[PDB]
Design a protein around this ligand. Structure first.
Ligand SMILES: CCc1cc(F)c2ccccc2c1CNC(=O)c1c(OC)cc(O)c2c1OC1=CC(O)=C(C(C)=O)C(=O)[C@]12C
Lengths: 11, 261
């Protein structure tokens, strides 16, 4: 779940 | 304190407005034809679909439509993710738990919010620039047709509740903060956040829908129903990329579905 991970940490 | 519960509801609503471009209010203003801007392009058959290509996009058709639903869902996952991060306490949770809450919650939210864009006759697509009829979607050859229909089935029942964007903002937050998702590491902090959101939802419904005392109880049941609804979705989907050679699945969607026992 590295993609969900990435979305959760950006912005 | 009830005051703080209303401040919370308003915070969630404001965040909701910032995260989701097309709200239910705006969706219904278009669906009912109360807007002045260009009404959506109606797609009710193969021919109309071809004509509206430029107005919605910035068996090859059934697959083509399926692909469209995939792209929208990907966009929806990102919008929901931004919303989740605005729920007080969410970003401070263990990161892997945040991933788990999203993994098991996104599709239930997608179904819920999809209802906002649907009526008995069809669904608004492309941020309201297009309208695809339910009968056209339902007629798509197997097994795609039965992949679209259930969403409308749910929407019709759910919309009978007459929730507004303010109600929905809290309802969605409650669903995302479910402390019983499989594999969560720290349950208590999630349960405490949900308990407060639930109190916020109860007050919102009591004040906003004074003549419908049964609403809160019904939404709690709807949350349970959404899980069953999502399981059936995941199955019917794992049979498509299982019985359709020409069927690629977006990485993000594969991640969410993978190990989603
Ligand atoms: C959230 C995605 C989802 C999941 C479901 F299970 C649904 C079931 C029934 C009705 C809509 C459903 C939807 C919503 N669908 C759409 O928004 C939706 C749709 O609709 C067919 C048909 C359709 O043609 C498209 C849709 O959204 C799209 C984004 C794209 O990037 C497309 C490109 C570039 O190809 C498309 O094709 C669009 C314009």
């Amino acid at each position: 779940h590295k993609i969900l991970h990435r979305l959760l940490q950006e912005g | 304190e009830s005051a703080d519960l209303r401040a919370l509801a308003k915070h969630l609503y404001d965040s909701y407005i910032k995260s989701f471009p097309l709200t239910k209010a705006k969706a219904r203003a278009i669906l009912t034809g109360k807007t002045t801007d260009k009404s959506p392009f109606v797609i009710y058959d193969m021919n109309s679909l071809m004509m509206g290509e430029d107005k919605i996009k910035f068996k090859e058709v059934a697959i083509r439509i399926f692909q469209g639903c995939q792209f929208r869902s990907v966009e929806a996952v990102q919008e929901i993710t931004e919303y989740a991060k605005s729920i007080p306490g969410f970003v401070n949770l263990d990161l892997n738990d945040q991933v788990t809450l999203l993994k098991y919650g996104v599709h239930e939210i997608i179904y819920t919010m999809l209802a906002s864009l649907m009526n008995k006759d069809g669904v608004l697509i492309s941020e309201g620039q297009g309208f695809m009829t339910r009968e056209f979607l339902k007629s798509l050859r197997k097994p795609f047709g039965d992949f679209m229909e259930p969403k409308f089935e749910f929407a019709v029942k759910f919309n009978a509740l007459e929730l507004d964007d303010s109600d929905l903002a809290i309802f969605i937050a409650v669903i995302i903060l479910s402390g019983d998702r499989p594999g969560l590491l720290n349950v208590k902090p999630i349960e405490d956040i949900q308990d407060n959101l639930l109190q916020a939802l109860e007050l919102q419904l009591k004040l906003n829908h004074p003549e419908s005392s049964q609403l809160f109880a019904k939404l709690l049941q709807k949350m349970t129903d959404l899980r069953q609804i999502v399981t059936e979705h995941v199955q019917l989907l794992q049979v498509i990329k299982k019985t359709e050679t020409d069927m690629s699945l977006h990485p993000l969607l594969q991640e969410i579905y993978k190990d989603l026992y």
